[PDB]
Write a structure and sequence with these properties.
The structure is a homotetramer of 238-residue chains. The first copy, chain A, contains 1 helix and 20 strands. Chain A is an all-beta fold and 238 residues long. The first copy, chain A, has one helix spanning 197-200; strands spanning 2-8, 18-22, 25-26, 32-33, 37-38, 41-42, 47-52, 56-57, 59-60, 65-66, 68-76, 87-95, 122-127, 139-144, 151-154, 163-170, 175-182, 187-194, 204-213, 224-234. Chains B and C meet through strand 1 and strand 8 of B and strand 1 and strand 8 of C. Strand 1 (2-8) of chain B pairs antiparallel with strand 1 of chain C, so a sheet runs across the interface. Bound molecules: a molecule of 6 linked components (NAG-NAG-BMA-XYP-MAN-FUC), a molecule of 4 linked components (NAG-NAG-BMA-FUC) (2 copies), 2-acetamido-2-deoxy-beta-D-galactopyranose (4 copies), calcium ion (4 copies) and manganese (II) ion (4 copies). The site of one manganese (II) ion has 5 residues of chain B, from strand 13.
């Protein structure tokens, strides 16, 4: 049996147990600021990610066991103009050596918009901009090896309000669940889908966040994570 | 700081740390069987509840702090005839000396269908039968001092399938959230509402389940809880 | 799998999830005051206990599995005259319906000084007074069904200083371990012994504290518990 | 608030969340084998270490808080000849970039036997061989910036038996406590001392194990870790 967990109720600057990639900083107020902010305003064509430093053991090929995990986080997206919000934020699992990919609507996760098993990405996206591959309206998606989501639901962005997310994986039913709640307006969202982690991901992964502002100057938003817990449990064989 | 927690991944017979009320038994397969089953079939006019034996400290009048809590459970409802399903199951918080009330659509929680502050009940209901006070269709509700829910959502009962529920209370936003997922069909439901526990409940409560089969012989279903975790945290002041 | 846990970093007055027995009160400073205090001084012939309200499932006769547990607590003993300190404090496990027994050197645990399997008591004692059955000097003991300890070590009472205790049970080796640390003086104590909980205790027990002041007016001390955590885990069968 | 934790009830081969240094391997039976073994006999002049991959945030200079932590582990030392046992095992905290130092009685921790504040090492040692700086007999020591322990106790090595260790740090009293229990013989050991982590260590550290076999062919032993849990909690400011 192997477990990993961590809790950040706020972030400290220069976090040596986080791998910050692209534009990501920790602010002095303790937020994980994924996309760049200049003179109080979001900057376009910005891409940031943040990963927990230690690899997570999510499945074992010797014993053929798969881990459960649950993560929670709070985030804020602030678009100066809501109709021109872009591009979004995602929580993801990826190979240990993962590096930022294309900015914009590919969210730093993929180098193109195709399906490809060699990506080894599972992600939950909070997608604020309609690209050619997206359904109509802002949405939450479960993504496996592609920016084109396996399943989506409608989600109305509440601008500059705190969103509380929980994402969990139940290995016995191969089910990934993702929920978002806005306590300020009592609005909530949920979806789940079958995802087989053993087929998709390597035995060890890194986990974290990615976000991207839009590729034109008028399509911008901030993406701040305020807090983050993670728990995984790789059980004994059964 | 005060915390309480417990986990049952299955139930043992004669559980001395559970207060079983009404018809409740533990089966040999380790399920908490809330309504009576005779010759493989559910019995009508059955009422059962089950509560954790220790009172939970959910708020402190000395320090004026309120607890957070999160509970998870799995349940199954099996109606021999789905169109004649009744009456439902609920998770609730109530005063320590709580006793079963009226059977049927009052779910063992209330002695009538009125709003009354002296009930001191907060509950999440999984309501399989439309009474005069209910909205159309089977539904999930948040209930405060009344069988008439403060807020509801549509919920399609998946007969004899395992439902995974999580209910949580965030004291800083006074928000109660309830989710239900069916991993078998990848279907999921969520709602949340403002509930002020300090106004509604006494400082110590008991927590648990209640269920009721219908009051006519043809309107019946089973109500089994398979597993239950509970966690509460009453923080230090300020 | 069944787990129970709780944490009190301090105690609130009228604690409804604790069974207070004998003289026990909660002070305004949030201490669990086991033996009586009058005009700033300890009172003789005083006996107090305190138990967590919910029974603990420590072993299951169906599956023949036994729980692990760990408990921690901080206590203070203040003897006005150290040479006349009596009688002591103990942490114990006992049947659910347990009631206080004889005061004095029997510590509220036993009705006599003999060995008897029908007691169903396992205890760790912090013994400040030499009775006929005791070794020389103040000591810590592991006690099974008798005030005459199965094993003891020397322990020097540090008067009015905070003692941090941890007691744990490892079921696979049948080993009970007890440690005491005084952080003020950097002094520490440990012992362990084989105890088979399945032979000694019923399936469900209550856990908590007992203490007794001496049976003459000049042989007195206070016994205050400042904080208490408990964790038990009854695993799935092998 | 920041917490880190992990649990290994056994080890898997090629553990990507452990930084293995020197001779360390994971066996097929799931042991962390710190010093080299050639066909079930220990090899001399062997040095191995193992660290959790993620840095631990043990204190924060912004908020002036210091973390508590607790770690537990099980180890086995098997000396073919007990009288010629060498050199030992240690649990330690060190700067993130820490590298193995001198083999033998310096245990892979230090490059010499002097006191030096630029080491930034806190360690608990299980020392099986008497060097010039050591007290008489095999012993457990608390070490701050030097192989010459700040405090020691006598410890009798029980050859090829499982030792259960717990080490904890209480920030409010600046107290480091270390215990060892042999459940097989019911023997146990404990010590504690004042250590101010803020003065000694950087804000982020790595934690783990080191071990060394002796520098002559007849002074050898194995050093296997069977299991390891770690928990740290860097609290919010008052
Ligand atoms: C482990 O604990 C067991 C109880 O948990 C012990 O068994 C019990 O032992 C008592 C004697 O102590 C038994 O009770 C007695 O029954 C006889 C015969 O009917 C009575 O003569 C006797 O009453 C007289 O003695 C009392 C003092 O002992 C006086 O107070 C009383 O006034 C009489 O003069 C006594 O009966 C009890 O009297 C008080 C009433 O409140 C009570 O209802 C009444 O029972 C008792 O029956 C027995 N219990 C059980 C369930 O068996 C056990 O003691 C050992 O075994 C017993 C049977 C005796 O042989 C003991 O000599 C022996 O020690 C004890 N074991 C040890 C090693 O301590
Ligand atoms: C699905 O994903 C795989 C793995 O990422 C893609 O194959 C890889 O494509 C890279 C190019 O983007 C290859 O590396 C290149 O090597 C050449 C020299 O040989 C260099 O000049 C160049 O700068 C790159 O480093 C990489 O080697 C290749 N790996 C394999 C196993 O083929 C794959 O890309 C698609 O197939 C490959 C073979 C190429 O034909 C690509 O053009 C093509 O996009 C991905 N498949 C799809 C359909 O996207
Ligand atoms: C809200 O719920 C409370 C608590 O259940 C109701 O108050 C209770 O009303 C009962 C009457 O139905 C009282 O019982 C009676 O006691 C008297 C004297 O002891 C007997 O003569 C008689 O035979 C009954 O058995 C009960 O004592 C009372 N309890 C309390 C704590 O007040 C309450 O009912 C409302 O207020 C009460 C005081 C009456 O005025 C009712 O008429 C009135 O409905 C409920 N409130 C509402 C608006 O429904
Ligand atoms: C393929 C791609 O990244 N498309 C981006 C879109 O995601 C969004 O950022 C938009 C804002 O103007 O510009 C497009 O270039
Ligand atoms: C108030 C009440 O219980 N009404 C019951 C309803 O809940 C259900 O049991 C049904 C089944 O026939 O009978 C109704 O008249
Ligand atoms: C058997 C018994 O309780 N003996 C007590 C002893 O514990 C202690 O209190 C002492 C002090 O004066 O008095 C004795 O009566
Ligand atoms: C400084 C040093 O490492 N001394 C080592 C001692 O630790 C032990 O290994 C011994 C083997 O018999 O050889 C000594 O030289
Ligand atoms: Ca998009
Ligand atoms: Ca109804
Ligand atoms: Ca005594
Ligand atoms: Ca040495
Ligand atoms: Mn999308
Ligand atoms: Mn309803
Ligand atoms: Mn004694
Ligand atoms: Mn030494």
């Amino acid at each position: 049996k192997e477990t990993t967990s961590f809790v950040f109720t706020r972030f400290s600057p220069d976090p040596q147990n986080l791998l910050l990639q692209g534009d990501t900083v920790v602010t002095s107020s303790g937020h994980l600021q994924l996309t760049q902010v200049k003179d109080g305003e979001p900057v376009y064509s910005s891409l940031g990610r943040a990963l927990y430093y230690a690899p997570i053991h999510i499945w074992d090929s010797n014993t053929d066991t798969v881990a459960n995990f649950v993560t929670s986080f709070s985030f804020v997206i602030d678009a100066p103009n809501k109709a021109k919000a872009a591009d979004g934020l995602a929580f993801f699992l990826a190979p240990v050596d993962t590096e930022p990919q294309k900015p914009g609507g590919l969210l730093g996760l993929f180098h193109d918009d195709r399906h490809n098993k060699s990506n080894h990405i599972v992600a939950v996206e909070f997608d604020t901009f309609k690209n050619s591959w997206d359904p109509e309206g802002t949405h939450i998606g479960i993504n496996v090896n592609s920016i084109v989501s396996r399943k989506t639901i409608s989600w109305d962005l509440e601008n500059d309000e705190v969103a509380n997310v929980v994402i969990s994986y139940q290995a016995s039913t191969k089910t990934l669940t993702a929920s978002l709640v806005y306590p300020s307006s009592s609005t909530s969202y949920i979806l789940n889908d079958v995802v087989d982690l053993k087929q998709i991901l390597p035995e060890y992964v890194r986990v974290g966040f990615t976000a991207a502002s839009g590729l034109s100057k008028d399509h911008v938003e901030t993406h701040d994570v305020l807090a983050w817990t993670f728990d995984s449990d790789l059980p004994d064989p059964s």
